[PDB]
Structures are given as C-alpha cells and as structure tokens.
C-alpha cells in the first residue's frame, strides 16, 4: 500500500533491459495504473511526489504541515530553477526498442511501506487429509492442513 491507501499486489518483474528509462537512465522502482488517480481522488500522493523530487534535488528535507501556505506554484518554480520540468512530466523511452514515447510521465521519488499479509501464510491446498472425529469432515485450520 501507499501512504494514501493504494493497496494491491505485484504483477510481475522485468529487468532493466526492458524497463522504461529516461535520459539520465533513472530506472524506476515500481509502476502502477493511472486509473487509481481520478477515481480515488488522491491528489496528496502526487503533491508528495513532487515535493519529494524537489527535496531530493535541493538536499533540504521537505514539509507536509497540514494547514499552511506551501503551494504547487512555489514547488514548481523551485524545481524549475533546479533545471527540470515545471510540473513533473518527463521525456521517457521504450523498454524494448527505445523508440520515443508518445506521452510523457509524472515520475519520481515517493515513500512506500510494507504490509504483513505475506503470501506464504495464505497459500493453502489439500486433498484427502485429516478427519474430525465429531463430524467425519475435513478439519479446520491452515496450521493442521485444513480444507
């Protein structure tokens, strides 16, 4: 999940020979679907990413500050004079052939975190196993190989 509720799981993993990549070759860590955005209405994730990028280029750490005056305009001008795009879009390349890409991508540093429900506690299958003596049925529990 994100810091804003974007839970899910991992589709696959490629490697850098066909991940998307930019002029400075900053290969990404993870990629998701834009269709999360205009339905869950999560602008905070985007503004976090933009302030994160300008913090990374500055060296200063950032700020969130729930009721204050930091705006997208100040963020834009700061990261602009640090020599990049005024909003966070980026020229980007094909993973496979490296042709130009039609659109452009908002892309940068962001903070994620790891959950607890890992896959090995949830994978479970059974055929012709133990019997419960009260009911002659398959017993409960992933622990004792249930059904």
């Amino acid at each position: 999940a994100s810091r804003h509720g974007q839970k899910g799981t991992i589709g696959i993993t490629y490697r850098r020979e066909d991940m998307p990549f930019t002029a400075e070759g900053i290969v990404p860590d993870l990629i998701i679907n834009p269709h999360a955005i205009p339905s869950r209405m999560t602008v905070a994730h985007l503004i976090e990413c933009l302030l994160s990028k300008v913090a990374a280029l500055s060296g200063n750490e950032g700020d969130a500050s729930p009721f204050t005056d930091i705006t997208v305009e100040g963020i834009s001008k700061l990261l602009r004079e640090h020599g990049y795009q005024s909003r966070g879009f980026e020229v980007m390349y094909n993973g496979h052939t490296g042709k130009k890409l039609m659109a452009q991508i908002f892309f940068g540093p962001t903070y994620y975190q790891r959950l607890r429900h890992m896959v090995d506690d949830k994978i479970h299958a059974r055929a012709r196993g133990p019997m419960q003596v009260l009911t002659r049925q398959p017993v409960e529990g992933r622990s004792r190989d249930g059904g």
């Binding site: 200063n60 700020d63 930091i70 963020i75």
Partner: peptide, 20 residues
C-alpha cells in the same frame, strides 16, 4: 515575497546568542 517554504533554527539560536 519569501513565503517560507523552509526554515532554519540553530542560526536563530546564534542570533539570540548575540542578542542576549
């Protein structure tokens, strides 16, 4: 305007070291 996107603290400590 300055608009204060970021702030400093121990510099102002030293400013009050000279002020006091």
């Amino acid at each position: 305007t300055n608009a204060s996107p970021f702030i400093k603290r121990d510099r102002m400590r030293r400013n009050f070291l000279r002020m006091r």
